[PDB]
Amino acid sequence: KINQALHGANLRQDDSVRNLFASVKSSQSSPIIPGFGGDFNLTLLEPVARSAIEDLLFDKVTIADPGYMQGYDDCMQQLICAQYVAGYKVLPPLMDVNMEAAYTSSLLGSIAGVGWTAGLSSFAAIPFAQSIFYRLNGVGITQQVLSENQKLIANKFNQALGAMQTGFTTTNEAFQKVQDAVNNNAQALSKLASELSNTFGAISASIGDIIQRLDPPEQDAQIDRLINGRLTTLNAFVAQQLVRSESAALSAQLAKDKVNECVKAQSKRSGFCGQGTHIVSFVVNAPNGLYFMHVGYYPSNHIEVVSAYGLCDAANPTNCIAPVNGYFIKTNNEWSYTGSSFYAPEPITSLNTKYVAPQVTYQNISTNLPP
Amino acid sequence: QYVAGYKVLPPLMDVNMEAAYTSSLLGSIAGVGWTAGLSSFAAIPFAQS
Amino acid sequence: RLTTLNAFVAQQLVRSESAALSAQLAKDKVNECVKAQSKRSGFCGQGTH
Amino acid sequence: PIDVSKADGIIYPQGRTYSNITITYQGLFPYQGDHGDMYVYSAGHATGTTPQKLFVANYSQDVKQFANGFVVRIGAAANSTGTVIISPSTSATIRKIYPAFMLGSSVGNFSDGKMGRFFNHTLVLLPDGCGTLLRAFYCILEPRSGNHCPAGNSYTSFATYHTPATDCSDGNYNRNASLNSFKEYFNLRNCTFMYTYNITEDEILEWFGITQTAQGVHLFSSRYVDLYGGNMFQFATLPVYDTIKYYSIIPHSIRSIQSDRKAWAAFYVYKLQPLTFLLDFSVDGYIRRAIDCG
Amino acid sequence: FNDLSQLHCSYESFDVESGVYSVSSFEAKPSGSVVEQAEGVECDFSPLLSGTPPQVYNFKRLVFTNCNYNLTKLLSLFSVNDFTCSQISPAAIASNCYSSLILDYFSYPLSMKSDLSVSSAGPISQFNYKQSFSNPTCLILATVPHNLTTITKPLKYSYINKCSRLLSDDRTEVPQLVNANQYSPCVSIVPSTVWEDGDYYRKQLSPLEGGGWLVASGSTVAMTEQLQMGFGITVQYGTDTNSVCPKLEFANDTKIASQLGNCVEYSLYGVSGRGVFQNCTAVGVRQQRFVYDAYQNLVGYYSDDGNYYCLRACVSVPVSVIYDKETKTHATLFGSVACEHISSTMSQYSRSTRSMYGPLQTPVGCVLGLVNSSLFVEDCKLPLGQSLCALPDTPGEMRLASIAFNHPIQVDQLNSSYFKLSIPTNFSFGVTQEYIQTTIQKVTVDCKQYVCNGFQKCEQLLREYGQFCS
Ligand SMILES: *[C@@H]1O[C@H](CO)[C@@H](O[C@@H]2O[C@H](CO)[C@@H](O[C@@H]3O[C@H](CO[C@H]4O[C@H](CO)[C@@H](O)[C@H](O)[C@@H]4O)[C@@H](O)[C@H](O[C@H]4O[C@H](CO)[C@@H](O)[C@H](O)[C@@H]4O)[C@@H]3O)[C@H](O)[C@H]2NC(C)=O)[C@H](O)[C@H]1NC(C)=O
Ligand SMILES: *[C@@H]1O[C@H](CO)[C@@H](O[C@@H]2O[C@H](CO)[C@@H](O)[C@H](O)[C@H]2NC(C)=O)[C@H](O)[C@H]1NC(C)=O
Ligand SMILES: *[C@@H]1O[C@H](CO)[C@@H](O[C@@H]2O[C@H](CO)[C@@H](O)[C@H](O)[C@H]2NC(C)=O)[C@H](O)[C@H]1NC(C)=O
Ligand SMILES: *[C@@H]1O[C@H](CO)[C@@H](O[C@@H]2O[C@H](CO)[C@@H](O)[C@H](O)[C@H]2NC(C)=O)[C@H](O)[C@H]1NC(C)=O
Ligand SMILES: *[C@@H]1O[C@H](CO)[C@@H](O)[C@H](O)[C@H]1NC(C)=O
Ligand SMILES: *[C@@H]1O[C@H](CO)[C@@H](O)[C@H](O)[C@H]1NC(C)=O
Ligand SMILES: *[C@@H]1O[C@H](CO)[C@@H](O)[C@H](O)[C@H]1NC(C)=O
Ligand SMILES: *[C@@H]1O[C@H](CO)[C@@H](O)[C@H](O)[C@H]1NC(C)=O
Ligand SMILES: *[C@@H]1O[C@H](CO)[C@@H](O)[C@H](O)[C@H]1NC(C)=O
Ligand SMILES: *[C@@H]1O[C@H](CO)[C@@H](O)[C@H](O)[C@H]1NC(C)=O
């Protein structure tokens, strides 16, 4: 029964991993080269093999190698080496670390391309700078400031991705979650490796010492007590593994949904995967799971201004216009247009508004008529 | 409760400040859901919303 | 008594995990169709929300 | 008061050492921060170089329960200077001395009726030969019946004098002349065993424990293993046949001359109770940090 | 019978599912035993080999318990002339351990040898020394070796030929019989060396001892060319613990350095188990000799050589199996281990291998049954781990391959105004089948009839439990 339960749990883990990696596998991609991102110094994501962020994340987290090359060989001469003393095998992962590297490379070289058109039929590997241009167009920032303010936003994005390397500490809640997940696996194995010393009412934890000290009629009861304790411990471990695997599968489905929503495409959901209005995301592996980081918009230095709901002619009240992805702003340098997330007063044209049905609620105007 | 002996720990949020949270949500939902993008606040009178 | 406390611990952890999942669901709901007007059918309101 | 973080006065595990790990350990330990029952020995009277009548306290009339054993610190005031008990106006260099203990399950009064006399078998540990010898003997104690003697007249207390000119002879003190002072009040009868130990002199702090087990009392020290440490270590397994209920300290005298009244040290006594500690076994495994639970 | 037998009995069927399975492990056999924590002391025979040996009526005693004695180092010192033993084999006293031993040495020439018998009635068998009737004994009549001066020779051999006690009437005479480990009263009046042959010794007896007079007669035989003497050993089996033993001749196979890096069953004088001893550096307290971990498992030990050792475990390798349905094919795998262990040092039941190349080193471990090949499989069915898989041949053994990565269709990110677009020119409709379990089987159970089955005494017993069914 215990072998059946562990085999079923491992098969569930394996095909859940296979399903998640099949879903995240992009159709088409561009090769990763130096100069990726152009002016953006995003080469930390670029792997030159795992990525530098991935290797730094492996280094900064207390991880013991699961003896896949010389585990018994290092046990010949010198916690992972304590694998047989209780009796258990840590299975190797279903995918190679190089297979993870190939998947992460595919996502990093394809995320610039997939994020331009609805539907995954085509692939659109535009240079990364123009991808950011179109994504910031998508959030409601006018093309004038993007045409005029490339250098400062490039420096802002670069320093934003450069600030997180020194933030690799307790403040990163993601590292805290990775750490106690790894600690959860470690203490789950330590439950097996430690409870052998428990006696459960017996006088010694060693069966051989029991048979070498005692007479058979009482060691029958002693061995029975200790094996009953060990079987109850193993049944509790089976239940713990089952509920942990079920939670892992649910989290895997959630991760697949998240990478299918705001990685391959630009989402609009309020803080579903990025606090603030989301712009882009990036994805790497993690020593137990999957690590996500997201770059989003954060406004500052807000100002209050006066605005309307629509411009209508006094002589022709039927002709009414409404702002498209923006607002109608009265400058105090006579109306003008502003974007939905930045203060950029610019003269109102036909390419940013839509003709709309008239109401009393808008403002009649007959002096400075927009085109 | 003490006859057995166990502390009923109070929640981290009091009544008044969590009520202030709910008041902020009530005052914001009139205007936030009018234009995509969470950057700009749009507190129109509620009937127009 | 220790058996009773062990059972209470297990039940409390199960309820805490269920409460955390419901908390995340409530967070998604309140950022989905409270701060905005979701077009999704019946996710948080029968008929057109 | 004893600091467990400073790791003073802790019984080491009896046979089970570790390394570089912080381990919980149940056993017999003193409470954290105890003032204890510190006593000081003093020298007798002296006019110039004439060895006069003794000068001690009323420690002999005091008896306390052995309970779960106790530990003794020696020479915490060494490498320093302090006052003399018999000469409060004079301060001399603080000199370490070792105390003599007597152990018995019985109670009773002396011939004059003063509390403190023990009956039947009695254990005595006396340091002799200027402290180099550690004589230990579990005998029947017979009081003498002379003047100022316990079975005789004018009895006040029994004391052990130490004449530095005679009892000791800077090397030739192996004549146990302070056991003679013990014989000058008491007599040994029907004795089970008689044990001595050799310990060199120094001016460094010392710790030892007198605490027992069931089948036999034990003698623990740091002297045998860690001179620079203070950890208890099993150096003697004394085979008593009964559990000793009460302990007492013997007042000790010194017949030094007046012009050379050396200032003595203070020794500290801490009783032990069954508790649990946390210990920090270092790479060498000696206890250097520990903490209480309760 | 084999791993597949255990796999079949695990599934309670003749048919199983193809895949990777964990079968019970095996253990490398212990190479031997080491016993080195506490050694005993040696028995003393220097007073036997030194000084003037006293006479036959003055046999001097050495008692032996809790000591080591080696007749190879002991009996070689004797110029052996006469050897007799009763109720014990001669080789047993040099080999077998005993509870206690007593050994009396006395002056005894070879001329007076024939009086040493128990059934004899001569003066030696009457007054001087009598053997043990109820205990096995051994008499050795030896000579001083010519190259041996540490023992000396007395003035003359002497013994008592007539010994008796006269009562208060002075007419009734009682001869004195010496028992085993006894002394005659005439020994008290006969000196350690009788002056000459036919000497008569006399003593007055106290009236409370029956009164009367005590008489004895002593006789002398002069020194020969070299002194001859006698040794008597009486063994005892139930008077002590079986402690006197010969040399522990295991100094070349029970030490730590003799069996470095090999699994042994240590018996460390109170501590026994299975493990591997390795030389190390002195850690922890050197005095306690026993250092353990947090989990009460020993990590090292301080031997008497001054060298500290670490003991980790007697560690072995688990065994896993890969099996395929509808192609009766299987192979064995050992993970996390170099290709170093072959079928020699086994345990448990047996091993399974067919179609007799064998050892194959993979990143998972060492595999028996596979074969190295340059194949790439993207739809593997039997995941061996990492990215390695095996594939049946549709009789042909399993083929090793790596998990084939499916490269996405590459497109070059150009650097100009133009752009290279990927567009599909063909399409299909794919059906994707999914199942969502929305309802478990609504089941009830009738508590009392399940737990009780309608017997009245059972419902009498279950009334006190009460609210569990509710
Ligand atoms: C009264 O005054 C005397 C003399 O001033 C003090 O005695 C000295 O105490 C210090 C304590 O730090 C000793 O220093 C220690 O030396 C150890 C090794 O030295 C010994 O071995 C060498 C080689 O044989 C000799 O040359 C040397 O004389 C010593 O015999 C070191 O290993 C010690 O390092 C330890 O440091 C700390 C703190 O002690 C520990 O926690 C570490 O684990 C480490 O083991 C240390 O450096 C010095 O040797 C002593 N000298 C003499 C002559 O005894 C008394 O301590 C002082 N007493 C009081 C109560 O104040
Ligand atoms: C892009 O960012 C990387 C990461 O900081 C910069 O590379 C570092 O340069 C410093 C300067 O000496 C070195 O000390 C670090 O070792 C480098 N780290 C890595 C990971 O290469 C790089 O200079 C930046 N490039 C640009 C153009 O800004
Ligand atoms: C703007 O001109 C329009 C056109 O006449 C006027 O708005 C009307 O106001 C009346 C009075 O309530 C309403 O009944 C009409 O329905 C409104 N028109 C529309 C199209 O809704 C009004 O004169 C002016 N309003 C403002 C605010 O300037
Ligand atoms: C120290 O005191 C002890 C008390 O017993 C003396 O020890 C024995 O003394 C007797 C004399 O009555 C001797 O026959 C024994 O040989 C002694 N035994 C041992 C082990 O010493 C001892 O003589 C005293 N030391 C002195 C006076 O220097
Ligand atoms: C002793 O334990 C500490 C605990 O962190 C560790 O850092 C140190 O490396 C250990 N010492 C040795 C020699 O391994
Ligand atoms: C102790 O010292 C005395 C005298 O110096 C000596 O007779 C005795 O043998 C010593 N004992 C030990 C164990 O060194
Ligand atoms: C054990 O190792 C120590 C240190 O490496 C070395 O000094 C010693 O000679 C070694 N002993 C043996 C028997 O190999
Ligand atoms: C298997 O074959 C491949 C290619 O022929 C080779 O690179 C590899 O080293 C081989 N492995 C073994 C264990 O023979
Ligand atoms: C763009 O690529 C062409 C090669 O087709 C090269 O000649 C040119 O220098 C490149 N322009 C850059 C890197 O700005
Ligand atoms: C599309 O692919 C199918 C599958 O082979 C083929 O039968 C069909 O002719 C293809 N259609 C076109 C337009 O290429």
Helix, coil or strand: residue D22: strand
The residues, any chain, with a CB within 8 Å of residue E201's CB and separated by 6 or more, are E186, E189, E190, E191, E215, E216, E217, E218
Q: Do B35 and A309 touch (CB under 8 A)?
A: no
Q: Candidates D73, D203, D228, D283: which one to mutate for ligand 1, based on the most atoms within 8 Å of Cβ?
A: D228
Which amino acid is it at D132? Answer: T
**Structure tokens given for E330:** 């299987």
Q: Going by CA atoms, what residue is nearest to atom 8 of ligand 7?
A: E307
Q: Is the CB of D19 under 6 A from ligand 5?
A: no
DSSP characters for B1-49? -TTT----PPPSS-HHHHHHHHHHHHHHTTTSTTSSSSSS-----TTT-
d(CA D237, CA D221): 12
Q: How far apart are CA E178 and CA E159, in angstroms?
A: 13
CB–CB of A89 and E405 under 8 A? no
Which element (helix H / strand E) includes E188? helix E185-189
Tell me how far apart the alpha carbons of residues E378 and E391 are, in angstroms, rounded to a whole number: 11
Give the phi and the psi of residue A92 in degrees, each rounded to 5. Answer: -65, 155
Task: Answer yes or no: are the C-beta atoms of E101 and E231 closer than 8 Å.
Answer: no
For residue B46, give the nearest of B32, B38, B36, A279 by alpha carbon.
B32
Place of tokens 């005091």: D62
How many angstroms separate the CA atoms of A348 and A342, rounded? 16
E201: left (phi over 0), alpha (psi -120 to 50) or beta: beta
Q: Which atom of ligand 1 is nearest to the CA of D79?
A: 1
Residues followed by a break in chain B (C to N exceeding 2.5 Å) are: none
- The 3 state secondary structure assigned to D100-150 is CEEEECCCCECCCCCECCCCCEEEEEEEECCCCEEEEEEEEEEECCCCCCC
End-to-end CA distance of chain B: 49
SS3 (DSSP) at E30: coil
Confirm if D208 and D12 have CB atoms less than 8 A apart. Answer: no
Q: Is residue E215 within 8 Å of E202, Cβ to Cβ?
A: yes
Report CA Rg, chain B: 19
- Cα separation values, E173 from E75, E182, E200, E350, Å: 43, 21, 16, 84
Rounded CA gap, E303 and E307, in Å? 6
The rounded distance, in Å, linking the Cα atoms of D17 and E299 is: 10
Burial of A2 (0-12, 13-18, 19+ CB in 10 A): exposed
Residue E388: exposure state from Cβ atoms within 10 A (0-12, 13-18, ≥19): buried
Any atom of ligand 3 within 6 Å of the Cβ of A358: yes
Residue B48's identity, in one-letter code, is Q
Q: CA torsion, points E274, E280, E285, E290, in degrees to nearest 10?
A: 10
Q: What are the backbone dihedrals phi and psi of residue E142, each rounded to the nearest 5 degrees, phi first? A: -125, 175
- Distance (angstroms) between ligand 2 centre and the Cα of A97 equals 25
Q: Are E316 and A84 a contacting pair, CB within 8 Å?
A: yes
- Number of CB atoms found within 10 A of residue A92's CB: 20
Is residue E383 within 8 Å of E20, Cβ to Cβ?
Answer: yes
- In chain C, what residues touch A247 (CB-CB under 8 Å)? 17
Ramachandran class of E171: left when φ > 0, alpha when ψ lies in -120 to 50, beta otherwise: alpha
**Residue E273, amino acid:** G
Residue E202, helix vs strand vs coil: strand
**String of DSSP letters for E316-359:** ---EEEEEETTTTEEEEEEET--TT--TTS--SS----------
| Burial (Cβ within 10 Å: 0-12, 13-18, ≥19) of residue A143 | middle
Q: Do residues D292 and D277 lie in contact, with contact meaning Cβ atoms separated by under 8 Å? A: yes
DSSP state of E468: T
- Using an 8 Å CB-CB cutoff, list residues of chain E that contact chain D: 283-285, 287-294, 299
Cβ atoms A312, A362 nearer than 8 A: yes
Q: Which two tokens stand for residue A329?
A: 């702003």
Q: Which residue is it, tokens 């006269």? A: E166
Strand arrangement, sheet containing D206-209: D233-238, D217-221, D206-209, D70-74, D268-271
Say if CB E411 and CB A29 are below 8 A apart: yes
- Residue A68 contacts residue E364 (beta carbons within 8 Å): yes
What is the helix (H) or strand (E) element at residue E104, kind and residue range? Answer: strand E100-107
Atom of ligand 3 nearest to the CA of A364: 28
* Tokens matching residue E360: 């194959």
Q: What is the rounded distance in angstroms from the CA atom of residue D261 to the CA atom of residue E257? A: 60
Cα–Cα distance measured from residue E364 to residue E6, given in angstroms and rounded to the nearest whole number: 23
* Residue type at position D138: Y
E387 closest CA partner among B13, A100, D222, A319: A100
Q: Is E82 left (phi over 0), alpha (psi -120 to 50) or beta?
A: beta
SS (H, E, C) A314-365: CCCCCCEEEECCEEEECCCCCCEEEECCCCCCECCCCCCEEEECCCCCCEEE
The DSSP letter of residue D198 is B
Count of CA atoms in the C-beta half-sphere (13 A) of E456: 0
CA A319 – ligand 3 centroid, Å: 13
Q: Are A354 and A321 spatial neighbours (Cβ–Cβ below 8 Å)? A: yes
How far apart CA D30 and CA E317 sit, in angstroms, is 48
Chain B interface includes C34 (CB < 8 A) = yes
Cα–Cα distance, A182 to A186 (Å, whole number): 6
| Cα distance between residue C1 and residue B41, in whole Å | 56
Helix A150-163 × helix A128-138 angle, to 10°: 100
Tell me the resolution in Å. 4.4
> Taking a contact as any Cβ pair under 8 Å apart, which residues of chain E between 311 and 340 contact chain A?
312-313, 315-318, 320, 335-338
Residue E376 makes CB contacts below 8 A (sequence gap 6+) with: E401, E402, E403, E404
Orientation angle between helical segments A2-24 and A216-261, nearest 10 degrees: 10
According to DSSP, residue E377 is labeled: E
Looking from the CA of residue A362, the nearest atom of ligand 3 is 27
Going by the DSSP 8-state scheme, the letter that residue E8 receives in this structure is H
Q: Please check whether residue D205 is in contact with residue D78, taking contact to mean a CB–CB distance below 8 angstroms.
A: yes
Among D176, D290, D155, smallest CA distance to D232 is for D290
Pairing of strands E263-267, E33-34: parallel
C13 by Cβ neighbours in 10 Å (0-12 / 13-18 / 19+) ranks as: exposed
Task: Tell me the C-alpha distance between A312 and A356, whole Å.
Answer: 9
How many residues appear in chain B?
Answer: 49
Alpha carbon D179 to its chain's center: 15
E376 bridge partner residues: E402
Q: CA D204 to CA D74: how far, in whole Å?
A: 9
